[PDB]
From a paper:
Crucially, SBPs determine the specificity of their respective transport systems, thereby governing the range of molecules capable of entering the cell.
Specifically, crystal structures of AliB in complex with peptide 2 (AIQSEKARKHN), peptide 3 (PIVGGHEGAGV), and peptide 4 (VMVKGPGPGREST) were solved at resolutions of 2.29 Å, 1.66 Å and 1.49 Å, respectively. The three complexes obtained for AliB exhibited minimal backbone changes among them (rmsd ranging between 0.1 and 0.3 Å). In all three complexes, mirroring the observation in the AliD:peptide 1 complex, the amine N-terminus of the oligopeptide establishes a salt-bridge with an aspartic residue (D503) and van der Waals interactions with the neighboring tryptophan residue (W500).
Author numbering:
A (entry chain A): 32 to 652
B (entry chain B): 1 to 10
The structure:
Amino acid sequence: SKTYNYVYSSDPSSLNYLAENRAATSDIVANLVDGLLENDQYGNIIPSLAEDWTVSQDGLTYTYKLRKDAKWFTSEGEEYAPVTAQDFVTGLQYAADKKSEALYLVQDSVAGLDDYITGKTSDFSTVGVKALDDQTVQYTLVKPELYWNSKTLATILFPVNADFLKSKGDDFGKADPSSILYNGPFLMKALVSKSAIEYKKNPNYWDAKNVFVDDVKLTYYDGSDQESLERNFTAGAYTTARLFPNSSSYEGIKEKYKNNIIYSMQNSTSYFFNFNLDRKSYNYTSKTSDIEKKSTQEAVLNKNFRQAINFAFDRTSYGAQSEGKEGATKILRNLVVPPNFVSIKGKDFGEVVASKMVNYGKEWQGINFADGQDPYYNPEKAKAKFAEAKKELEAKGVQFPIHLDKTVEVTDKVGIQGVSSIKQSIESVLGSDNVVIDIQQLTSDEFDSSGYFAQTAAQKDYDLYHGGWGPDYQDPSTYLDIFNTNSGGFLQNLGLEPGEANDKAKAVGLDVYTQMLEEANKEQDPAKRYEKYADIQAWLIDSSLVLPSVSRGGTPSLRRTVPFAAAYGLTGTKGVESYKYLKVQDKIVTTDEYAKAREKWLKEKEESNKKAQEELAKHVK
Amino acid sequence: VMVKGPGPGR
């Protein structure tokens, strides 16, 4: 049989795909539960549980016909029940009742849903999801959304069987394979914390013909043994291996695999640094006095200070820590929205953002937002902005240097080198009499509970954070909404809570940012809409409330996977996250073989995208 | 979706 063997690095807090917005959950559930639609190898949206669909002429009513052979299975593979339209009613009501962390995807879109969530109504029958019959689910929206179908690839719109959900109660969706039912390509055979994730092909899945591996086995990787990836690939145990050009082992690796190193493309997941604008927790700090803590609290609210950090942060040096000197720039990402995420009359989003920067000050003159280069690092500009910040901050009694805590996992050797790089860059440019980056090396549990898995803003224990966003649907709002003060998914990472904007949020202008988002969202013409979102992205770059850093992809690997066999998606959870479509082979792929396959894929993608646009018109009814 | 990393994945 055919097996894929590699590693994983993030244990999930749960399998609750209806309540979670973390990739630690959806990366797993992508393989276990299907929704209405999915992706092909080219990023087109194709049938999944829904074999057909229509949209009304006014754009408000979407109706999906579910295929009759789709079933729910237990973790052991036994059939539980057919998938029915009611399962989509159940899923949305459960997501609403549980206050899902991904509710922003649906709460302002589905008719009646906001009223139900906020208690203006108590009757879910007034909410715009209905099972018209066992095979037909109908959604009613508040306003047209050309990106609505792309939202169905997000797990909050996935179904759940109501009887199973009732039987499980509070046990539903725990980190245990028996806590959910399965209707997707795989069953989960093992889920062991800090050890293993194992998938087994479900032979009775409706689309089993498109599952080309029988088993997927992932061993836990904590970052302490980066050479283990190539070592186990060469030993024949892993199907692929990410390469680390800084290793002492790399010279021998590049000689042995001179014709096999493959670089991936940068993808739509964007990372950035942000500041904690309202820090409450100080378990992990080098500050020892209230004056230091209050000084840092003031500094992060100062725009000139944030801009000075931005201009002092050498992204090339940062990327070199993981990619080596020659690949250092291959991972660089300079906006939250990828520069090619959308186009406006033939011009990419990033070029439009650059043109909007003309109105945000001389410090942005000539900026270029293309991937793969560093347009931010500029020591002279950083020093000048810092001088302005220092005058403003000293007048408030702020003490210098400003100490900024950044966390990192003690086992994450490459991550330690990355954070050491930012410390060296910022302190070298601005002076350690002005800024100190204090690196806090934490255990796994401490790192989790003070960051990604912290449950409130008050538990965020750092001054600087380095997280990222993967897009949920095909519109710039998926990225730019994450900082809005009403419901932004990234607010807690900034130390803020969704709701009324507090004095810290207003001090940095996030109330104004939120009003801008509301106005842009009303625009229905794509070109005008995207231009308004480009101005919003420009505002955010200027605010330096985010410091764009890197993307996923752009990295070297060795591979025994078949090039371009897997699903690909610009947004959602049904692309690279899924082991459906993926194929393995005996031969180690060569760089030349991969390049030939890539050119074929690029060409076919354009052809297939054009066909997919023509297929769309047939669905208007 | 909220992401961590980046680390060695697919």
